[PDB]
Amino acid sequence: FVRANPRSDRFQALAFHHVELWCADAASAAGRFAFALGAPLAARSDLSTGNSAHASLLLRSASVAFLFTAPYGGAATTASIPSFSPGAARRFAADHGLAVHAVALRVADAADAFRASVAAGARPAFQPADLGGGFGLAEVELYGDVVLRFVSHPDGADAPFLPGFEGVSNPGAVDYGLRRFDHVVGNVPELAPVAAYISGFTGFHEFAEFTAEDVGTAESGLNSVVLANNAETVLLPLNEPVHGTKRRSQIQTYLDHHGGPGVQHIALASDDVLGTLREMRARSAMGGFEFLAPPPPNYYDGVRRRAGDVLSEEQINECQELGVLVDRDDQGVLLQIFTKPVGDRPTFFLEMIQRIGCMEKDESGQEYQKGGCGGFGKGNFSELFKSIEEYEKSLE
Amino acid sequence: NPRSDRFQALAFHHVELWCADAASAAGRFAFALGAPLAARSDLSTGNSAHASLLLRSASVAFLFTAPYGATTASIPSFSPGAARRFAADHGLAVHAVALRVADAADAFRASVAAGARPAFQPADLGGGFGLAEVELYGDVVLRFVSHPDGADAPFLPGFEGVSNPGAVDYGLRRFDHVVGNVPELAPVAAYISGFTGFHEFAEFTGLNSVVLANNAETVLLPLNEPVHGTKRRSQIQTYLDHHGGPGVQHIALASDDVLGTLREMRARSAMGGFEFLAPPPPNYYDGVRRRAGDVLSEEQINECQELGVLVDRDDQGVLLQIFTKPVGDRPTFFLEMIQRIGCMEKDESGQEYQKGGCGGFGKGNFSELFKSIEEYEKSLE
Ligand SMILES: Cc1nnc(NC(=O)c2ccc(C(F)(F)F)n3c(CS(=O)(=O)C(C)C)nnc23)o1
Ligand SMILES: Cc1nnc(NC(=O)c2ccc(C(F)(F)F)n3c(CS(=O)(=O)C(C)C)nnc23)o1
Ligand SMILES: [Co+2]
Ligand SMILES: [Co+2]
Ligand SMILES: [Co+2]
Ligand SMILES: [Co+2]
């Protein structure tokens, strides 16, 4: 945590493009995720689009783009994602269940970002192709069975997602306010070699970094590093467990139940996460996502000190009604809530956030939003535990 | 009504689906059908074998079960390798059709003795519960479950109940019929009738169908087969092709107000719920305004029109009907929402009951659909 930014990207990583989850049936996860996140179906490539290889359904809420893909029974030239391996998809679901297979970035050229990546260490995974329309697809391995997909497309274009995908516009479809992906975090057994591997090939630089003296629940804990693209728009953190602890990490609990490295959580950022949260919790009771237990009152009594200078009492009283966590950085405020495990295993979960502050000006006096404004809520580990404990003593 | 049941076949207990992840289908089916989570059996209940979630709307009981990564299994038939293959081979599909029986062990021994291929040897789940399985068709088992009348565990032993406040139903009251698609009808029916003593309710000859039923005609197990030497393509062969063999084609879920139910179901369509087939052409409804004007108001038929409900009649009773689009990724499994009007006939002590099958199964509508489609296309040049 020097916080420098050497702009060392080896390829132009413009933005997150989508995230592809694999499973045995895409209809069902897509279904739930739509209702739960307010990310209605925006595109499909199934049998009805002439694709006999895979069934791909795509949820969108603004920039947020959750792709769900699954194999049909048993062609192959009908695939719209030609990286797709039925054999490998089947394995993935058997090994993990609901989990993220790919993390896609939009880049300048897919061919180039690969070549530069592979040349700077990256393990290949899918050899660049032209999907027509001037769309490029290329994949390198990131951690474990998770791949880093590259996607390039002329700025105008047609196929809004990928060639072969037929758009979808249900009327009655409403989003809940999720604007963008913020960060995509991977649990790994040992951090150093993984961190090196990626920065090695992407040219991403360290943005932040927390070890675990009081950054890990109880005896166990985690060692987190954050890797950032030049613009600090794309953030790929990594957790590892702290070794030789007395109790077991949840980063280890993940690794065990998941059967390897993989994406632990994805943070979905909103411009009114409170408003978003209301919609999301209304669905909780009928098949949406359920959230972690609300912090006890003491927590908030504390956020009235920490962040009362920048949050109104009407805001904080709402943050409390909705179990939202609060954290400050050098110059900003992070609102933060975590879902319960989203699939069957205590593995993957989602993070809903809002970033308040850090808006700087350029060389002509134009305001931009500094990414990572508010940090990632490292304080809430420590601050939950002590309030959770102080609560219980308050009960004799 | 032969009355040949070889075991005590009380009622449908549940239908169990195998996927790679129960959370997701159980979460979706929940708000698509209005069937709130009613019971779980997973890590948080000490089961590390498998993850089961039970949706319940009245008597409708949808169980979703998925393997994890020993003695901890709540359903001790579960085999993880089987599930792995099931999901891989079918996607989302019904694995188990469960009947409530008097003893289960007895149901098994009787059944097996009368031809049934064994699947799971009788267990005692505890709390007076009995569980056994035999082969129905394909991978699909017929699961016997037996409990004491009151009992404890609402579902099965090892299952913590669930009651989120703000849960709702959309009126679905029970399972009406569970239809299986097979390649050849004659052998399958022979086998099922052979071991259950279910009798033929009726027989269609699209597809060729038979409806095996229990003594009370409360449990209905239809069976279709594709038409041999077919000129076109059968929706049953399609099924058989994309699904990779015999399996449950659809399940009809009955409602006391199918039209109110439907309203609720259709509002969820846009945000991830089920979508229903295209509505029939205007002619269709002028047709029902003829064949069924005497039993349905002019205001009722107009709601059927709004919502795409189909109508049919039998000797003495009316059928409302609406099918869902394939509920999975594959064009295989779908679901029927139906209401049965009439046929509440008396016994010999006075006590009238609702007779099963009231309104038939909508078979007629097959032709009426096709004919109204043709007609409507002509009048549009
Ligand atoms: C880098 C980077 N990106 N995000 C992060 N950190 C988190 O997401 C994070 C922050 C705070 C907390 C909490 F306050 F609640 F303890 N987190 C948790 C909670 S937990 O462990 O499920 C819990 C069940 C122990 N998970 N991730 C985070 O670091
Ligand atoms: C036995 C037994 N139990 N139920 C039945 N019949 C049906 O469910 C059934 C009735 C009517 C119709 C329809 F009106 F639309 F033609 N069905 C359909 C239509 S379909 O094929 O999806 C169509 C999309 C090819 N599927 N099952 C039925 O038979
Ligand atoms: Co580039
Ligand atoms: Co986070
Ligand atoms: Co019996
Ligand atoms: Co039917």
Backbone angles phi, psi at A379, to 5 degrees: -65, -30
3-state DSSP assignment of residue B191:
helix
Judge contact between A40 and A34, C-beta under 8 A.
yes
Q: Establish whether residue B177 lines the binding site of ligand 2, counting it when its CB lies within 6 angstroms of any ligand atom.
A: yes
Structure tokens at A299: 């927590």
CB atoms within 10 A of CB A214: 14
Q: Establish whether residue B42 lines the binding site of ligand 2, counting it when its CB lies within 6 angstroms of any ligand atom.
A: no
With CA atoms as reference, report the closest residue to B173 among B312, B57, B2. Answer: B57
Judge contact between B108 and B122, C-beta under 8 A.
yes
Judge contact between B104 and B145, C-beta under 8 A.
yes
With CA atoms as reference, report the closest residue to A185 among A367, A381, A362, A351. Answer: A351
To test the contact with chain A by mutation, choose from B18, B19, B24 the residue with the greatest count of A C-beta atoms within 10 A, namely: B24
Cβ contact B43–A343 (<8 Å): no
Cα distances (angstroms) measured from residue B241 to each of A133, B245, B330, B334: 34, 7, 10, 16
Residue with tokens 């919790």: A281
3-state DSSP assignment of residue B74:
coil
- Residues counted in chain B: 381
Burial-class residue A2 by CB neighbours within 10 Å (0-12, 13-18, 19+): exposed
To test the contact with chain A by mutation, choose from B52, B85, B92, B271 the residue with the greatest count of A C-beta atoms within 10 A, namely: B271
Distance CA B321, CA B301 (A): 13
Residue with tokens 């980063």: A251
DSSP bridge pairs for A223 = A240
**Closest chain B CA to residue A40:** B271
The 8-class DSSP code of residue B378 comes to H
Cβ contact B42–A344 (<8 Å): yes
Cβ contact A288–B90 (<8 Å): no
Q: Establish whether residue A185 lines the binding site of ligand 1, counting it when its CB lies within 6 angstroms of any ligand atom.
A: yes
Torsion of CA B165, B171, B173, B179, to 10 degrees: -110
Cβ contact B28–A40 (<8 Å): no
Contacts of A370 (CB under 8 A, 6+ apart): A232, A332, A358, A359, A360
Contacts of A117 (CB under 8 A, 6+ apart): A10, A11, A140, A150, A201, A202
Q: Establish whether residue B179 lines the binding site of ligand 2, counting it when its CB lies within 6 angstroms of any ligand atom.
A: yes
Q: Shortest Cα distance from B303 to chain A (angstroms)? A: 20
Strands B207-213 and B199-204: antiparallel
Ligand nearest to the CA of A203: 3
At how many degrees (to 10) do helices B298-307 and B282-291 cross? 150
Strands B220-226 and B207-213: antiparallel
Judge contact between A15 and A234, C-beta under 8 A.
yes
Judge contact between B5 and B198, C-beta under 8 A.
yes
DSSP bridge pairs for A334 = A327, A355
Structure tokens at A373: 């404004």
- Architecture field, domain A13-167: Roll (3.10)
Contacts of A266 (CB under 8 A, 6+ apart): A19, A100, A181, A183, A184, A185, A350, A351
**Closest chain B CA to residue A28:** B25
Alpha carbon nearest to ligand 2 atom 29, residue:
B361
Structure tokens at B270: 């846009």
Judge contact between A210 and A226, C-beta under 8 A.
no
Q: Establish whether residue A338 lines the binding site of ligand 1, counting it when its CB lies within 6 angstroms of any ligand atom.
A: yes
Residue with tokens 């088992």: B141
Residue in A27, A90, A97 nearest the CB of B92: A27
Q: Establish whether residue B309 lines the binding site of ligand 2, counting it when its CB lies within 6 angstroms of any ligand atom.
A: no
Continuous H helices in chain B? 22-33, 80-90, 105-113, 185-196, 235-243, 258-267, 282-291, 298-307, 363-378
Name the percent of chain B in helix, strand, coil, to the closest 5. Answer: 30, 35, 40
Name the maximum alpha-carbon separation found in chain A: 68
Closest atom, ligand 1, to C-alpha of A225: 1
Distance CA B125, CA B128 (A): 7
With CA atoms as reference, report the closest residue to A180 among A26, A9, A354. Answer: A354
3-state DSSP assignment of residue B353:
strand
Residue with tokens 């129960």: B22
Alpha carbon nearest to ligand 2 atom 23, residue:
B235
Burial-class residue A243 by CB neighbours within 10 Å (0-12, 13-18, 19+): exposed
DSSP bridge pairs for B11 = B100
Q: Shortest Cα distance from B27 to chain A (angstroms)? A: 4
Structure tokens at A284: 């909780």
Contacts of A177 (CB under 8 A, 6+ apart): A38, A61, A270, A271, A272, A273, A275, A276, A279
Judge contact between B181 and B334, C-beta under 8 A.
no
Residue with tokens 């019929």: B177
Q: Shortest Cα distance from B13 to chain A (angstroms)? A: 22
3-state DSSP assignment of residue B220:
strand
Letter string b/e over residues B1-20, b meaning 16 or more CB atoms within 10 A of that residue's CB = eeeebbbbbbebbbbbbbbb
Structure tokens at A213: 């003296």
Q: How far apart are the first and last CA of chain A?
A: 41
Judge contact between B140 and B251, C-beta under 8 A.
no
Q: Establish whether residue B323 lines the binding site of ligand 2, counting it when its CB lies within 6 angstroms of any ligand atom.
A: yes
DSSP bridge pairs for A19 = A66, A103
Judge contact between B60 and B175, C-beta under 8 A.
yes
| DSSP notation for B33-59 | HT--EEEEESGGGT--SEEEEEEEETT
Which CATH number is B172-378's, of 3.40.980.10, 3.40.50.720, 3.30.70.2860, 3.10.180.10?
Answer: 3.10.180.10
Judge contact between A24 and B88, C-beta under 8 A.
yes
Q: Shortest Cα distance from B274 to chain A (angstroms)? A: 9
With CA atoms as reference, report the closest residue to B255 among B264, B246, B247. Answer: B264
Cβ contact A285–B22 (<8 Å): no
> Measured in angstroms, how far is the CA atom of residue A262 from the centroid of ligand 1?
16
Q: Establish whether residue B310 lines the binding site of ligand 2, counting it when its CB lies within 6 angstroms of any ligand atom.
A: yes
Distance CA A118, CA A111 (A): 11
Contacts of B27 in chain A (CB under 8 A): 28, 31-32, 35-36, 287-288
Judge contact between A357 and A374, C-beta under 8 A.
yes
A178-393, CATH topology level: 2,3-Dihydroxybiphenyl 1,2-Dioxygenase; domain 1 (3.10.180)
- Cα four-point dihedral sign B264, B270, B275, B279: positive
Residue ranges of chain A that CATH labels 3.10.180.10: 13-167, 178-393
Cβ contact A29–B31 (<8 Å): no
**Closest chain A CA to residue B84:** A94
**Closest chain B CA to residue A260:** B69
> Measured in angstroms, how far is the CA atom of residue A90 from the centroid of ligand 4?
29
Judge contact between A104 and A18, C-beta under 8 A.
yes
Report the residue numbers after which chain A has a gap, meaning the C atom sits over 2.5 angstroms from the next written residue's N, or none: 74
Q: Shortest Cα distance from A395 to chain B (angstroms)? A: 26
Distance CA B191, CA B178 (A): 17
Judge contact between B244 and B272, C-beta under 8 A.
no
Contacts of A86 in chain B (CB under 8 A): none
Distance CA A225, CA A195 (A): 8
Q: Establish whether residue A325 lines the binding site of ligand 1, counting it when its CB lies within 6 angstroms of any ligand atom.
A: yes
Distance CA B369, CA B311 (A): 11
- Residues counted in chain A: 396
With CA atoms as reference, report the closest residue to A58 among A158, A184, A161, A137. Answer: A161
Residue ranges of chain B that CATH labels 3.10.180.10: 9-161, 172-378
> Measured in angstroms, how far is the CA atom of residue A210 from the centroid of ligand 6?
59
Q: Shortest Cα distance from A135 to chain B (angstroms)? A: 26
Q: How many CA atoms lie within 13 A of A9 on its CB side?
A: 19
Judge contact between A302 and A383, C-beta under 8 A.
yes
Amino acid sitting at position B63: L
With CA atoms as reference, report the closest residue to B360 among B311, B306, B324, B327. Answer: B311
3-state DSSP assignment of residue B320:
strand
Cβ contact A25–B25 (<8 Å): yes
Q: Pocket of ligand 2, candidates B242, B310, B323: which has the most ligand atoms within 8 Å of its Cβ, to mutate?
A: B323
Cβ contact A25–B273 (<8 Å): no
| Gyration radius from chain A CA atoms | 21
Three-state SS across chain A?
CCCCCCCCCCCCEEEEEEEEEECCCHHHHHHHHHHHHCCCEEEEECHHHCCCCEEEEEEEECCEEEEEEEECCCCCCCCCCCCCCHHHHHHHHHHCCCEEEEEEEEECCHHHHHHHHHHCCCCEEEEEEECCCCCEEEEEEEECCEEEEEEECCCCCCCCCCCCCEECCCCCCCCCCEEEEEEEEEECCCHHHHHHHHHHHHCCEEEEEECCCCCCCCCCCEEEEEEECCCCCCEEEEEEECCCCCCCCHHHHHHHHHCCCEEEEEEEEECCHHHHHHHHHHHHCCCCCCECCCCCHHHHHHHHHHCCCCCCHHHHHHHHHCCCEEEECCCEEEEEEEECCCCCCCCCEEEEEEEEECEEECCCCCEEECCCCCCCCHHHHHHHHHHHHHHHHCCC
Cβ contact A286–B30 (<8 Å): yes
Cβ contact B27–A32 (<8 Å): yes
* CATH, domain range B9-161: 3.10.180.10
Q: Pocket of ligand 2, candidates B366, B367, B368, B371: which has the most ligand atoms within 8 Å of its Cβ, to mutate?
A: B366
Distance CA B217, CA B214 (A): 5
Q: Shortest Cα distance from B131 to chain A (angstroms)? A: 25
Residue B218 Rama label (left phi>0; alpha psi -120 to 50; beta): alpha
Contacts of A36 in chain B (CB under 8 A): 27
Q: How many CA atoms lie within 13 A of B56 on its CB side?
A: 17
Residue in A36, A46, A344 nearest the CB of B21: A344
3-state DSSP assignment of residue B210:
strand
Structure tokens at B75: 């359903």
Burial-class residue A353 by CB neighbours within 10 Å (0-12, 13-18, 19+): buried
Resolution in A: 2.9
DSSP bridge pairs for A338 = A351
Distance CA B133, CA B154 (A): 20
Q: How far apart are the first and last CA of chain B?
A: 50
DSSP bridge pairs for A359 = A369
Q: Pocket of ligand 2, candidates B181, B236, B327, B363: which has the most ligand atoms within 8 Å of its Cβ, to mutate?
A: B363
| Gyration radius from chain B CA atoms | 21
Cβ contact B91–A47 (<8 Å): no
Strands B334-341 and A367-369: unpaired
Residue with tokens 């409302």: B320
Distance CA B270, CA B2 (A): 47
3-state DSSP assignment of residue B263:
helix
Continuous H helices in B57-141? 80-90, 105-113
Q: CB within 5 A of ion ligand 6: which residues? A: B 252, 336, 361
Ligand nearest to the CA of A115: 3
Distance CA A145, CA A158 (A): 31
Backbone angles phi, psi at B126, to 5 degrees: 95, 170
